[PDB]
Design an enzyme around this catalytic site. Structure first.
Site, PDB file in Angstrom:
ATOM      1  NE  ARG A 184     -39.864 -16.844  10.882  1.00 15.67           N
ATOM      2  CZ  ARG A 184     -40.973 -16.140  10.693  1.00 15.67           C
ATOM      3  NH1 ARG A 184     -42.137 -16.764  10.522  1.00 15.67           N
ATOM      4  NH2 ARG A 184     -40.918 -14.812  10.676  1.00 15.67           N
ATOM      5  CG  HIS A 235     -33.122 -16.067  11.644  1.00 10.26           C
ATOM      6  ND1 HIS A 235     -34.297 -16.783  11.581  1.00 10.26           N
ATOM      7  CD2 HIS A 235     -33.478 -14.782  11.887  1.00 10.26           C
ATOM      8  CE1 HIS A 235     -35.321 -15.968  11.766  1.00 10.26           C
ATOM      9  NE2 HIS A 235     -34.850 -14.754  11.971  1.00 10.26           N
TER      10      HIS A 235
END
Ligand code: SAM
Length: 390
Positions: A298, A301
């Protein structure tokens, strides 16, 4: 034609369960798709406008402690609620009526109100009510500002730390999203609590077999096992090692910004044994060489393709030939699902994007890596993309 027939059967079936985890979500999707079919544009736009009024009523009644003033069970008059919160009963009534009409609240008689299962989470401070607040306070303004934003900055994908759609919508395009949310720890507090919901989800252990890492941990008793690149509080590393004696948390490295690593230190219990802690910038050279596994979860992104290639290129240079890089991200289908397309546009307000496996392939290859495989979570698109040096 056919889809109406299918959903109609899922409707009869669930009516007697009233008197199956995938069964709930096949029905929520079919109801949405059926709604879209039966609906024409004018009903679509009335529905959209209703959603905006509903979230506004949700936001105000939370803010004004109205959901608090309504007992979780039983009824209370509009007058009694209004005196409890010290607010114009007419305004309380008009806003409550929005939520009565949409089924979030329930009206009893002509003047009494009560909670439902859908409104009780808003009665206290918690991740769900934090998400409601954050959506309204931190994402809606940026969305509404996008027409002017793209006239101002050009009609292209927005990237970069400064001049985000969010900062533009806040009147401060020069500041980063971090500076904006940090200048009011009340705002940071709602952001932090809201992300607690999705910190548990998609655990890496059990989805990815690390037995092969165990064999490496024995065959080389010195080399770093798992480097969590941008791993925040190291919860992913903990879960991996927790009850695996062959995968020792002491042999892994948690990397993040120095300010984040310092907070990790200042909030550990004394004898709690942890991974190695290393403050660093993953836009720079990777300090740990030849680990068995590099994990970047994560993080990509948030950045443009070009920044992702720089980040991954540093990891590839530090990897050995038998190393593996695990990218934890949503992998969009083409076309993407509803929630991932929504998150894709939310990320655009802060300079990021979601990506298909094709877009990841382009980025990974430019960094001298190649995609060896993809492990996708059941029931969603969050995945671990397993990459190796090319
Ligand atoms: C969305 S969080 C992901 C945290 C964790 N990997 C997870 O799965 O929950 C992005 C993380 O990247 C870190 N980060 C941002 N920029 C960084 C940088 N330049 N160098 C190292 N870490 C960075 C942030 O501090 C944050 O912990």
């Amino acid at each position: 034609a056919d889809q109406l027939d299918s959903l109609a059967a899922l409707l009869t079936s669930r009516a007697q369960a009233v008197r199956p985890p995938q069964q709930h979500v096949q029905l929520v999707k079919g109801l949405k798709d059926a709604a879209g079919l039966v609906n024409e544009a004018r009903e679509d736009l009335g529905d959209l406008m209703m959603s905006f009024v509903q979230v506004t009523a949700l936001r105000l009644l939370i803010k004004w402690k109205v959901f608090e003033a309504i007992p979780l069970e039983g009824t209370i008059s509009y007058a009694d609620v209004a005196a409890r919160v010290g607010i114009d009963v007419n305004l309380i009534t008009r806003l409550s009526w929005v939520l009565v009409a949409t089924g979030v609240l329930k009206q009893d008689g002509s003047d009494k109100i009560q909670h439902t299962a859908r409104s009780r989470p808003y009665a206290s401070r918690n991740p769900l009510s934090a998400m409601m607040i954050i959506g309204f306070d931190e994402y809606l303004p940026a969305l509404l500002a996008m027409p002017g934003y793209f006239d101002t900055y050009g009609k292209k994908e927005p990237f970069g730390e400064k001049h985000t759609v969010k900062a533009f919508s806040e009147g401060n395009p020069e500041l980063t999203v971090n500076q904006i949310l940090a200048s009011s720890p009340e705002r940071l507090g709602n952001m932090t609590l809201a992300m607690a919901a999705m910190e548990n989800m998609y655990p890496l252990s059990g989805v990815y077999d690390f037995s092969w890492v165990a064999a490496k941990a024995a065959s080389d008793s010195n080399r770093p096992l798992i480097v969590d690149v941008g791993g925040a509080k190291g919860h992913t590393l903990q879960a991996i090692c927790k009850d695996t004696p062959a995968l020792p948390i002491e042999r892994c490295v948690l990397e993040d910004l120095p300010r984040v690593i310092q907070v990790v230190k200042d909030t550990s219990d004394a004898g709690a044994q942890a991974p190695q802690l290393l403050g660093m910038d993953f836009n720079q050279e990777q300090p740990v060489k030849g680990a068995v596994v590099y994990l970047i979860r994560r993080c990509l992104h948030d950045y443009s393709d070009e920044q992702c290639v720089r980040i991954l290129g540093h990891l590839a240079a530090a990897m050995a030939a038998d190393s593996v890089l695990l990218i934890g991200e949503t992998v969009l289908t083409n076309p993407p699902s509803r929630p991932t397309a929504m998150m894709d546009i939310l990320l655009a307000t802060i300079g990021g994007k979601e990506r298909t496996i094709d877009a990841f392939g382009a980025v990974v290859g430019r960094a001298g890596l190649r995609i060896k495989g993809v492990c996708k979570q059941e029931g969603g698109d969050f995945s671990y993309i397993e990459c190796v040096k090319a």
